[PDB]
Amino acid sequence: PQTPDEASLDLAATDGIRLGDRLRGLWDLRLVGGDAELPGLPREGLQLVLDVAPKGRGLIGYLDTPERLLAAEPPRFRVLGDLLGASSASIRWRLVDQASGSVAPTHDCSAVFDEVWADGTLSGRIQRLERSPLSPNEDFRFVAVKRHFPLAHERIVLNEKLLGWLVSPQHRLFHQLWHASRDKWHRLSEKQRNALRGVGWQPGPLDRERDARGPRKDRNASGIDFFFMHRHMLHTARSMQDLPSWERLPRPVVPLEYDRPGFIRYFDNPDGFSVPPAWVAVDDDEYSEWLHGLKSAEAYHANFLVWESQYQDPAYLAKLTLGQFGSELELGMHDWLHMRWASVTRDPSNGAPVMTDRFPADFAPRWFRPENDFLGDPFSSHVNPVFWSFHGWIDDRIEDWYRAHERFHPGEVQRREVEGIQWFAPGRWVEVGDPWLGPATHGLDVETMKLALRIIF
């Protein structure tokens, strides 16, 4: 056999990328055995922090007490390893004694990854490199447990008044149905359309419906409905609680290489704005790869950072009517904002992860509990505290669109109050003047909305 003639960029594959994602984070460590002792460290109450680049094959980390990991001084032990030939069955890394004054490894570690559904488990053995392998077996083993990634609602608390208004069946169904009709109107048969008209849930004015995802979606003023309704939802919600809008989009997690305490803090999700780790959908690899990149860091620099720039650039906004700006923003950024900060679908009763997303027609009573705040569903997305941070951001950009036109087209856009909400008069850049707030404007009953949703799905 012949060895390679030169080195070649060895980017991680799907299996290697997924392995690194199982490891990246903060772990609580425990030493077991008669010979289980690390210089200057207890046997209990330890932590293991690890990190792997998005497509990297090298493994890094640190092993010390919780306080020392956050302190600026170099931790007592540093991790170095690689994932070549690694898997859930075998992972290996070495420990460097930062106090010994030498980068030479002092210990050799192996581990196996497991899953417990009663966020991760690592267990294996450690070997002192000074000890000889021909000596009696050394009872040195460890067990690690990946620390729970806090949910948004576990860090941003919505008071009972507001939260009670969101989780109400009269509101969950409204939001789902408000999106459902316009999202699917362009694919409904005439029989279905006539039925929605029979209950007053046609998207927009009767016989002049504004489909949201049809061919004329950009020109049919549908965007005006999206902006206005969600601003209407903000106004009433902000009267019950202070809901500051995002000023900037949260940056991706800082690598463990450059800010060890910051990296650790990110996995505690202190401000609730941390990107939840992606989850692998069963028997749907195309969707899993889609969600993964949507949450990656290169998607932040390739897409989310471009949107934050475009929708605050005057020259870019001055070219769009409110109907265009809304439809463009909703179809691209809005849908991606939800899934980027979306956590895994969970059972409302117990909170354990549920791989199968809720069926749109499933109206069981358990789904109505406050535990269900899945951002991937309009029936529950409005419950997530992050929902209101980035929808406040979107709304504020409407003023950038007004300021832009006053610069390039002074006078062609006029403000106006509509339904007790600051808005704009119909004109050259405002296609229509009757925003669609459901049957209230172009016609709540809970049993009716269940029917309408049943018609659609």
Ligand X SMILES: N[C@@H](Cc1ccc(O)cc1)C(=O)O
Helices 385-408 and 322-329, axial angle in degrees (round to 10): 150
Residue pair 427/415 in contact by the 8 Å Cβ criterion:
no
- Phi, psi at residue 78, to the nearest 5°? -120, 145
Q: Tell me how far apart the alpha carbons of residues 318 and 386 are, in angstroms, rounded to a whole number.
A: 29
**167, interface contact from a copy of itself, ligand X, none, CB < 5-8 Å by kind:** none
Q: Tell me how far apart the alpha carbons of residues 401 and 47 are, in angstroms, rounded to a whole number.
A: 49
**129, interface contact from a copy of itself, ligand X, none, CB < 5-8 Å by kind:** a copy of itself
The response to whether 230 counts as a known ligand-binding position is yes
Q: Please identify, using beta-carbon distances, which residue of 93 and 174 lies nearer to a copy of itself.
A: 93
The response to whether 153 counts as a known ligand-binding position is no
In the complex, minimum distance from the CB of residue 342 to a copy of itself, in angstroms, rounded to a whole number:
15
**338, interface contact from a copy of itself, ligand X, none, CB < 5-8 Å by kind:** ligand X
In the complex, minimum distance from the CB of residue 40 to a copy of itself, in angstroms, rounded to a whole number:
21
In the complex, minimum distance from the CB of residue 413 to ligand X, in angstroms, rounded to a whole number:
27
Q: Please identify, using beta-carbon distances, which residue of 179 and 442 lies nearer to ligand X.
A: 179
In the complex, minimum distance from the CB of residue 218 to a copy of itself, in angstroms, rounded to a whole number:
4
The response to whether 338 counts as a known ligand-binding position is yes
Q: Please identify, using beta-carbon distances, which residue of 335 and 406 lies nearer to ligand X.
A: 335
Q: Please identify, using beta-carbon distances, which residue of 97 and 371 lies nearer to a copy of itself.
A: 97
Q: What is the DSSP string of 253-284?
A: PPPTTT-HHHHHHHTT-TTS-SPPPP---TT-
The response to whether 232 counts as a known ligand-binding position is no
Q: Please identify, using beta-carbon distances, which residue of 72 and 118 lies nearer to a copy of itself.
A: 72
Q: Tell me how far apart the alpha carbons of residues 355 and 163 are, in angstroms, rounded to a whole number.
A: 25
Token representation of residue 314: 């005057």
Residue pair 400/311 in contact by the 8 Å Cβ criterion:
yes
Q: Tell me how far apart the alpha carbons of residues 193 and 195 are, in angstroms, rounded to a whole number.
A: 5
In the complex, minimum distance from the CB of residue 440 to ligand X, in angstroms, rounded to a whole number:
18
Q: Tell me how far apart the alpha carbons of residues 293 and 110 are, in angstroms, rounded to a whole number.
A: 30
Helices (H) and strands (E) in the chain, counts: 17, 10
Q: Please identify, using beta-carbon distances, which residue of 85 and 420 lies nearer to a copy of itself.
A: 85
Q: Please identify, using beta-carbon distances, which residue of 20 and 438 lies nearer to a copy of itself.
A: 20
The response to whether 382 counts as a known ligand-binding position is no
Q: Which positions lie near ligand X, rule CB under 6 A?
A: 179, 335, 338-339, 376-378, 381
Q: Tell me how far apart the alpha carbons of residues 197 and 439 are, in angstroms, rounded to a whole number.
A: 10
**73, interface contact from a copy of itself, ligand X, none, CB < 5-8 Å by kind:** none
Q: What is the DSSP string of 282-334?
A: TT-HHHHHHHHHHHSSHHIIIIIHHHHHHTT-HHHHTT--HHHHHHHHIIIII
In the complex, minimum distance from the CB of residue 198 to a copy of itself, in angstroms, rounded to a whole number:
29
**97, interface contact from ligand X, a copy of itself, none, CB < 5-8 Å by kind:** none
The response to whether 409 counts as a known ligand-binding position is no
Strand, helix or coil for residue 450: helix
Residue pair 228/423 in contact by the 8 Å Cβ criterion:
yes
Q: Please identify, using beta-carbon distances, which residue of 186 and 346 lies nearer to a copy of itself.
A: 186
**305, interface contact from a copy of itself, ligand X, none, CB < 5-8 Å by kind:** a copy of itself
Q: Tell me how far apart the alpha carbons of residues 437 and 445 are, in angstroms, rounded to a whole number.
A: 14
**217, interface contact from a copy of itself, ligand X, none, CB < 5-8 Å by kind:** a copy of itself
**309, interface contact from a copy of itself, ligand X, none, CB < 5-8 Å by kind:** a copy of itself
Instruction: Kindly compute the dihedral angle of the four CA atoms of residues 210, 216, 219, 223, in this order, to the nearest 10 degrees.
Output: 50
In the complex, minimum distance from the CB of residue 405 to a copy of itself, in angstroms, rounded to a whole number:
12
Task: Give whole-number Cα distances, 14 to 100, 299, 300, in Å.
Answer: 38, 17, 20
In the complex, minimum distance from the CB of residue 244 to a copy of itself, in angstroms, rounded to a whole number:
13
Instruction: Name the residue with the smallest CB distance to ligand X.
Output: 378
Binding site feature residues: 175, 179, 230, 334, 338, 391
Binding site feature residues for Zn(2+): 175, 179, 230, 334, 338, 391
